[PDB]
């Protein structure tokens, strides 16, 4: 049912420096921490109203991780232009996303921590916590240095431990809004489903399958069935 | 809450 | 939130006699448990580390558990070789680099087992000067304690062990000398429990 | 462990500046420092990453550290105080995690170096009574006078250090315990079988290494510079 | 890759000067992108804005809205208005 997420971004300037770290995090689409690299004293900041009422030393192991993370990311982001014989004239990117999902149980279901490189797949851990996939030869040199540094074992560590407390922490504090289901308003073509939270949501075969927009309220809208968690019974639309 | 990075954990 | 606490401070054992030295911990989240093992005013040394609870790690006469909230380095037959200070070292997975919080300590010391003691106390002289002398308290058992005097201008030292290896051979002793001439042999470690036994040369 | 740092021994005024250096273990990238106050546990200092800083912990304003690009490291500790009195220790990461420590650098901080001596050694030949007795000769050498603490006291027989047999105390004796500045006494003791004594070939010397000044002070006393330097007290086997 | 633009009401369409304009503007990389909101003609101004994220396929996502693009791969702006309808 729930579900945790850390997106990163390591985007390449045109000459010796300076490349741009952004890191942010998420519960279940929901926004609740962003640090930008660029500023002259750079801070993690609250993004979501629940995540206001965490003391300073949370805040400043934030920092810390994506401070020495916008180190650890120009030393790779040259590792990579490195094995791919690429001048420093271009601007180039490493993204990452890695997090944890749960049952209503409240067991871990599967973790992640995957990567790519100017856009496309690079490294990823798989199901089992315990190997990784790469992509092509280059991804292969990363993997040899990740087994060495024992670097599965710590996410495996992390994803089980310290990302299930907080994710679990992070729902009870936010409750009213995070373990809520708001159920769509629809309308009829055309079949409409307004304001509904979370996304996952089925409208239904070779039809018009508009993706899922956000509206700006932290609701959802899409445009036959509306199947959504928020509704006790699937909703059955035909008009006039 | 996010993960540390150790060392040598680079790409 | 990053903190070790190892227990007792100091551990006095038996030669033989076994046990386990304490070290609780906190982190955020933890990456690995390390033991370290410290020799008086020298660099720690690492024995082993511990990545998940359940894990065990064992090097001879050490064997190291792990828990959620406690680490255990269990000492099985301790030798008084064994004795150093035991350290206790955590890394946190909710923090940047490879940075240990240590504990501070369990000081072991391993009392040796004497098979055949025969106590006695010597009187010896310098090679150089004739007015400087020595008394030697030896092969003593491990249950006695060399007291200090309460007089400076005695100078009295603690028990140590040698061990005359080639010849399967342990033995204690304790020094005791003084600034003027007017001390003996005989009342060198007066305010010691000496055993009933004790040798005393005329 | 294989990383080293020197000096091993520093002895200095309040008010000084001394530089403390350390070599990773070879291959290792990072360099981390501890500082080991007396009765206290190891705390973490800083720590550099392939030349540059990363973690830092509990360092002063007044102490400086940097990582040259050969990976070797330098801690500076300037307007020393006498509480700066430590073990110094440097460490660098493996892969998989431990640190390996160096062998570590005692500082010891002084008001006035007019204080400072270096050990007088004298060596106690077995007694009569002890052979007649044992069928064992124990030999016994006094290391006295000495300030500071910093003293190695090892024994030699025929040009070859030997540690069978040998006992050393486990810490210096306050010769005057109520001063503040006292000078310290160590003791040793060789035993080796009576036969072994009874030969006149046989050469017995107790070696006590200090460590003193070297040139980081002026010397304005009418006594000799108390220098790092060895004082030994020698003995030849006694048939009698 | 190209961006998939998605111009509509916050709320449905209705005259009583309650609304807010977004533009869902996802699918695209890299990152730098140019989106505007046009009045009548072509300018407007204190337009709101989204914090960039990206999506599991490795694509951005972002929307601007007020209170009621430009890529690298378009060679001209991609200007697409209208419809309360859709």
Same mark, same amino acid.
Not at chain 1, 142 to 149: D, F, L, M, P, S
Not at chain 1, 155 to 170: F, K, P, Q, S
Not at chain 3, 92 to 116: A, K, Y
């Given at each position: 049912?729930?579900?945790?997420?850390?997106?990163?971004?390591?985007?390449?300037?045109?000459?010796?420096?300076?490349?741009?770290?952004?890191?942010?995090?998420?519960?279940?689409?929901?926004?609740?921490?962003?640090?930008?690299?660029?500023?002259?004293?750079?801070?993690?900041?609250?993004?979501?109203?629940?995540?206001?009422?965490?003391?300073?030393?949370?805040?400043?192991?934030?920092?810390?991780?994506?401070?020495?993370?916008?180190?650890?990311?120009?030393?790779?982001?040259?590792?990579?232009?490195?094995?791919?014989?690429?001048?420093?004239?271009?601007?180039? $990117?490493?993204?990452?996303?890695?997090?944890?999902?749960?049952?209503?149980?409240?067991?871990?279901?599967?973790?992640?921590?995957?990567?790519?490189?100017?856009?496309?797949?690079? $490294?990823?851990?798989?199901?089992?916590?315990?190997?990784?996939?790469?992509?092509?030869?280059?991804?292969?040199?990363?993997?040899?240095?990740?087994?060495?540094?024992?670097?599965?074992?710590?996410?495996?560590?992390?994803?089980?431990?310290?990302?299930?407390?907080?994710?679990?922490?992070?729902?009870?504090?936010?409750?009213?809004?995070?373990?809520?289901?708001?159920?769509?308003?629809?309308?009829?073509?055309?079949?409409?489903?307004?304001?509904?939270?979370?996304?996952?949501?089925?409208?239904?075969?070779?039809?018009?399958?508009?993706?899922?927009?956000?509206?700006?309220?932290?609701?959802?809208?899409?445009?036959?069935?509306?199947?959504?968690?928020?509704?006790?019974?699937?909703?059955?639309?035909?008009?006039? | 809450?996010?993960?540390?990075?150790?060392?040598?954990?680079?790409? | 939130?990053?903190?070790?606490?190892?227990?007792?401070?100091?551990?006095?054992?038996?030669?033989?006699?076994?046990?386990?030295?304490?070290?609780?911990?906190?982190?955020?989240?933890?990456?690995?448990?390390?033991?370290?093992?410290?020799?008086?005013?020298?660099?720690?040394?690492?024995?082993?580390?511990?990545?998940?609870?359940?894990?065990?790690?064992?090097?001879?006469?050490?064997?190291?558990?792990?828990?959620?909230?406690?680490?255990?380095?269990?000492?099985?037959?301790?030798?008084?070789?064994?004795?150093?200070?035991?350290?206790?070292?955590?890394?946190?997975?909710?923090?940047?680099?490879?940075?240990?919080?240590?504990?501070?300590?369990?000081?072991?010391?391993?009392?040796?087992?004497?098979?055949?003691?025969?106590?006695?106390?010597?009187?010896?002289?310098?090679?150089?000067?004739?007015?400087?002398?020595?008394?030697?308290?030896?092969?003593?058992?491990?249950?006695?304690?060399?007291?200090?005097?309460?007089?400076?201008?005695?100078?009295?030292?603690?028990?140590?062990?040698?061990?005359?290896?080639?010849?399967?051979?342990?033995?204690?002793?304790?020094?005791?000398?003084?600034?003027?001439?007017?001390?003996?042999?005989?009342?060198?470690?007066?305010?010691?429990?000496?055993?009933?036994?004790?040798?005393?040369?005329? | 462990?294989?990383?080293?740092?020197?000096?091993?021994?520093?002895?200095?005024?309040?008010?000084?500046?001394?530089?403390?250096?350390?070599?990773?273990?070879?291959?290792?990238?990072?360099?981390?420092?501890?500082?080991?106050?007396?009765?206290?546990?190891?705390?973490?200092?800083?720590?550099?990453?392939?030349?540059?800083?990363?973690?830092?912990?509990?360092?002063?304003?007044?102490?400086?550290?940097?990582?040259?690009?050969?990976?070797?490291?330098?801690?500076?500790?300037?307007?020393?105080?006498?509480?700066?009195?430590?073990?110094?220790?440097?460490?660098?990461?493996?892969?998989?995690?431990?640190?390996?420590?160096?062998?570590?650098?005692?500082?010891?901080?002084?008001?006035?170096?007019?204080?400072?001596?270096?050990?007088?050694?004298?060596?106690?030949?077995?007694?009569?009574?002890?052979?007649?007795?044992?069928?064992?000769?124990?030999?016994?050498?006094?290391?006295?006078?000495?300030?500071?603490?910093?003293?190695?006291?090892?024994?030699?027989?025929?040009?070859?250090?030997?540690?069978?047999?040998?006992?050393?105390?486990?810490?210096?004796?306050?010769?005057?315990?109520?001063?503040?500045?006292?000078?310290?006494?160590?003791?040793?003791?060789?035993?080796?079988?009576?036969?072994?004594?009874?030969?006149? #070939?046989?050469?017995?010397?107790?070696?006590?290494?200090?460590?003193?000044?070297?040139?980081?002070?002026?010397?304005?006393?009418?006594?000799?510079?108390?220098?790092?330097?060895?004082?030994?007290?020698?003995?030849?086997?006694?048939?009698? | 890759?190209?961006?998939?633009?998605?111009?509509?009401?916050?709320?449905?369409?209705?005259?009583?000067?309650?609304?807010?304009?977004?533009?869902?503007?996802?699918?695209?990389?890299?990152?730098?992108?140019?989106?505007?909101?046009?009045?009548?003609?072509?300018?407007?101004?204190?337009?709101?804005?989204?914090?960039?994220?990206?999506?599991?396929?490795?694509?951005?996502?972002?929307?601007?809205?007020?209170?009621?693009?430009?890529?690298?791969?378009?060679?001209?702006?991609?200007?697409?208005?209208?419809? #309360?309808?859709?």
């Amino acid at each position: 049912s729930h579900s945790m997420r850390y997106f990163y971004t390591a985007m390449s300037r045109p000459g010796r420096g300076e490349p741009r770290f952004i890191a942010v995090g998420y519960v279940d689409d929901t926004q609740f921490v962003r640090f930008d690299s660029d500023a002259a004293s750079p801070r993690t900041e609250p993004r979501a109203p629940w995540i206001e009422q965490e003391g300073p030393e949370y805040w400043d192991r934030n920092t810390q991780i994506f401070k020495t993370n916008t180190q650890t990311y120009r030393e790779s982001l040259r590792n990579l232009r490195g094995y791919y014989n690429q001048s420093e004239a271009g601007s180039h $990117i490493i993204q990452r996303m890695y997090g944890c999902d749960l049952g209503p149980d409240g067991r871990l279901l599967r973790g992640h921590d995957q990567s790519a490189y100017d856009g496309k797949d690079y $490294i990823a851990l798989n199901e089992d916590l315990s190997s990784w996939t790469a992509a092509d030869t280059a991804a292969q040199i990363t993997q040899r240095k990740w087994e060495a540094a024992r670097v599965a074992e710590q996410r495996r560590a992390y994803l089980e431990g310290l990302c299930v407390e907080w994710l679990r922490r992070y729902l009870e504090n936010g409750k009213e809004t995070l373990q809520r289901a708001d159920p769509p308003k629809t309308h009829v073509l055309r079949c409409w489903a307004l304001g509904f939270y979370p996304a996952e949501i089925t409208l239904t075969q070779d039809t018009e399958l508009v993706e899922t927009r956000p509206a700006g309220d932290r609701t959802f809208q899409k445009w036959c069935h509306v199947q959504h968690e928020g509704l006790p019974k699937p909703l059955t639309l035909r008009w006039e | 809450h996010p993960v540390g990075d150790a060392d040598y954990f680079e790409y | 939130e990053d903190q070790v606490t190892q227990s007792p401070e100091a551990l006095r054992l038996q030669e033989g006699e076994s046990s386990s030295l304490n070290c609780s911990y906190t982190v955020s989240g933890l990456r690995g448990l390390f033991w370290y093992r410290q020799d008086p005013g020298k660099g720690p040394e690492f024995l082993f580390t511990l990545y998940s609870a359940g894990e065990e790690k064992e090097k001879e006469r050490l064997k190291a558990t792990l828990t959620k909230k406690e680490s255990f380095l269990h000492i099985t037959a301790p030798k008084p070789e064994d004795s150093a200070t035991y350290l206790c070292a955590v890394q946190d997975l909710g923090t940047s680099g490879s940075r240990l919080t240590f504990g501070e300590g369990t000081q072991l010391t391993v009392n040796p087992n004497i098979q055949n003691p025969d106590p006695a106390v010597y009187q010896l002289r310098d090679s150089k000067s004739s007015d400087k002398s020595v008394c030697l308290f030896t092969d003593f058992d491990s249950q006695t304690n060399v007291s200090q005097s309460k007089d400076s201008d005695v100078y009295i030292t603690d028990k140590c062990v040698l061990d005359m290896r080639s010849m399967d051979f342990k033995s204690n002793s304790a020094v005791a000398w003084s600034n003027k001439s007017d001390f003996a042999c005989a009342n060198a470690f007066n305010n010691s429990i000496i055993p009933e036994d004790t040798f005393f040369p005329s | 462990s294989g990383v080293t740092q020197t000096p091993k021994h520093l002895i200095t005024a309040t008010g000084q500046r001394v530089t403390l250096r350390c070599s990773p273990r070879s291959g290792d990238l990072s360099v981390y420092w501890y500082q080991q106050s007396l009765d206290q546990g190891l705390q973490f200092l800083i720590q550099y990453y392939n030349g540059e800083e990363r973690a830092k912990g509990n360092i002063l304003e007044r102490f400086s550290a940097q990582q040259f690009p050969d990976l070797h490291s330098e801690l500076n500790l300037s307007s020393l105080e006498l509480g700066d009195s430590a073990l110094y220790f440097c460490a660098s990461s493996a892969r998989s995690g431990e640190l390996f420590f160096g062998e570590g650098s005692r500082l010891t901080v002084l008001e006035d170096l007019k204080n400072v001596f270096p050990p007088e050694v004298a060596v106690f030949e077995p007694s009569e009574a002890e052979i007649s007795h044992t069928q064992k000769a124990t030999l016994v050498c006094l290391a006295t006078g000495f300030y500071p603490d910093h003293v190695e006291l090892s024994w030699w027989v025929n040009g070859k250090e030997v540690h069978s047999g040998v006992c050393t105390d486990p810490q210096p004796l306050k010769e005057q315990p109520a001063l503040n500045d006292s000078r310290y006494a160590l003791s040793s003791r060789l035993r080796v079988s009576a036969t072994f004594w009874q030969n006149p #070939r046989n050469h017995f010397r107790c070696q006590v290494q200090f460590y003193g000044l070297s040139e980081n002070d002026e010397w304005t006393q009418d006594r000799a510079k108390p220098v790092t330097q060895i004082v030994s007290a020698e003995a030849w086997g006694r048939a009698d | 890759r190209t961006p998939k633009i998605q111009v509509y009401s916050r709320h449905p369409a209705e005259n009583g000067k309650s609304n807010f304009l977004n533009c869902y503007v996802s699918g695209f990389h890299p990152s730098d992108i140019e989106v505007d909101l046009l009045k009548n003609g072509e300018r407007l101004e204190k337009v709101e804005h989204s914090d960039l994220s990206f999506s599991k396929d490795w694509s951005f996502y972002l929307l601007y809205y007020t209170e009621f693009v430009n890529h690298v791969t378009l060679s001209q702006p991609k200007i697409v208005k209208w419809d #309360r309808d859709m």
